[PDB]
């Protein structure tokens, strides 16, 4: 044999809750998730959570988008020949510029706390630990 | 009002022509543009299964715990994509009513003016927008590889993107929609605004 092995036992906080055929489907689908995660390396999973979090960037922003998207609808209902998303967004954008932490994030934290929890675990090492999460059996009713 | 919506849909599958007691079930949470839509368009699959006009109460309890905006009074899910994403009609007297597109894959929210005519007649039959707003460009591709879904199924990622999944077609599996969306809404706390 002659090998060193890193073996991780994290639960999802809070547990998934539930409110006939439905409870079957959700235990069933949570296990599928639970298994799919444990096939991933710590490194893989964290590269995927970083990839997920870089999606999405306020009353004033929503006010901005309100004005822009309301204008496009105007242009669009008016004409009968369709617009292209890339063109029309930049159009209205320069018109306006002429008057201008739940379960999955807890999992990422619970985990990150382990990886630093002494002994600290390094990025290369992460390519060699398997995820070890259990949550599907914790389905609260 | 939705002729131009219904026509560009090839392969439609109405599963339940809409009542009036159905429409009155949601009078407290609906609006006339959406009530007339339920009148012109029944619950079913549209645009090759991509779009599903759903029973709002199937999802309405799942997503009314979703913080979108201050002073939201009600979220009325009325449509779903073939990936589990949710369209809701949101009543808000401070901001004005509006539609939220919740991307269940990326955990994001898109605020859309509550112009159902514009939404259904000129945004949906526009591939630029299916890609630009809803990220549904690869629907054809996904179906070629995974197979076609029924009305109550969708393409789930296992594990989801929010739980560290890859986003390859290797991880997509046809599964029951409603429990999928439920699962995903329980994973992500806030659906942050979509960089758009």
Residue numbers in the entry:
A (entry chain A): 173 to 180, 182 to 192, 199 to 236, 241 to 283, 320 to 360
B (entry chain B): 1 to 196
Give passages from the manuscript.
We identify a horizontally transferred T6SS with Ntox15 family nuclease effector (Tde1) that mediates interbacterial antagonism among Bacteroidales, including several derived from a single human donor. Effectors with novel toxin 15 (Ntox15) DNAse domains, also known as toxin_43 domains, degrade recipient genomic DNA. Cognate immunity proteins are encoded adjacent to T6SS effectors and neutralize their activity to prevent intoxication of self and kin. Crystallographic snapshots of isolated Tde1, the Tde1/Tdi1 complex, and homologs from Phocaeicola vulgatus (Tde2/Tdi2) illustrate a conserved mechanism of immunity inserting into the central core of Tde, splitting the nuclease fold into two subdomains.
Orphan immunity proteins co-expressed with the P. vulgatus dnLKV7 homolog Tde2tox in E. coli also formed a stable 1:1 complex, as detected with analytical gel filtration chromatography. We therefore obtained crystal structures of the Tde1 Ntox15 domain in complex with Tdi1, as well as a homologous complex from P. vulgatus dnLKV7, Tde2tox and Tdi2. The Tdetox/Tdi complex homologs exhibit very similar structure despite 51% sequence identity between the Ntox15 domains, indicating a conserved mode of effector–immunity interaction. When bound to immunity proteins, Tde1tox and Tde2tox split into two subdomains. Forty percent (17 of 43) of immunity-contacting Tde1/2tox residues in the effector immunity structures form part of the central core in the globular Ntox15 domain alone structure, and many of these are highly conserved. Tdi1 and Tdi2 form extensive contacts with the conserved central cores of their Tdetox counterparts. We conclude that Tdi immunity proteins induce a marked conformational shift in Tde effectors, driving a division into two subdomains with disruption of the enzymatic active site and DNA binding motif.
